[PDB]
Design a protein around this ligand. Structure first.
Ligand SMILES: [Mn+2]
Ligand SMILES: [Mn+2]
Lengths: 146, 146
């Protein structure tokens, strides 16, 4: 009734430890603080849609999503994909200074967690491609569950 | 305090509409009835571990998981992977008749949902490989969120 509005913040951040699919798409559900992250080979409009398809399966459909003005978020293709799901999109104030510190903070916690767990498994540089998926899933678990 | 025990049921089911990665690994969290499904090319011990890595990221670590005696669930490799996470594993009673109707039911709801959504998009036989991921994610959303 009076609980938080279901607003997500989403952003992409680069992580060479996860190459070749080094772009991580990160969504923070601002009502719960849960984090959803997926890995992608290139930052395109279709990679953002594939990330949100997975975040929806996991967190439900939000009422709105806030992003920056990155072109994979403002293309015609991504605007139509969000209209097909009935989700409102805002890039907030222009020179907003950033109405998305929560996802910015999530991005740093996430890359720190990835580094600490990868180094615990003995991977000091790039994580071998066949170990990436389970280590990303472990970083996600660690940041969402207590 | 007196709520449901965190027990999952997991099973693999075959779905040719999703070929080549036609094996679907399905986990039902018996306390919440939430469903987690991932797609795999072969039914192996590593495909079950990769599915549970993702289910853990999404639902948290359970106290125990019930499966059938399928060899990808009873191998040495899968038993050690569950011991590393500290999760108890039971295949229930031997000739239990099936202590896993919930996941059995989830399997049929899931393949029905996949068929109805794929046919709504015009795919009457196999779903094209590049449309699979978003349609699986849509079937998962539809069965978990109201
Ligand atoms: Mn950005
Ligand atoms: Mn089975």
């Amino acid at each position: 009734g009076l609980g938080p509005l279901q607003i997500w913040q989403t952003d992409f951040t680069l992580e060479p430890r996860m190459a070749p699919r080094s772009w991580l798409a990160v969504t923070v559900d601002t009502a719960s603080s849960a984090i959803v992250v997926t890995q992608h080979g290139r930052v395109t409009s279709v990679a953002a849609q594939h990330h949100w398809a997975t975040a929806i399966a996991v967190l439900g459909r939000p009422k709105a999503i806030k992003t920056d003005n990155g072109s994979c978020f403002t293309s015609k293709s991504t605007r139509e994909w969000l209209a097909r799901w009935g989700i409102a999109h805002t890039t907030g104030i222009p020179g907003n200074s950033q109405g998305q510190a929560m996802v910015e903070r999530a991005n740093r916690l996430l890359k720190d967690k990835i580094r600490v767990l990868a180094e615990g498994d003995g991977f000091m540089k790039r994580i071998p491609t066949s170990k990436q998926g389970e280590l990303l899933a472990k970083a996600m678990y660690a940041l969402n569950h207590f």
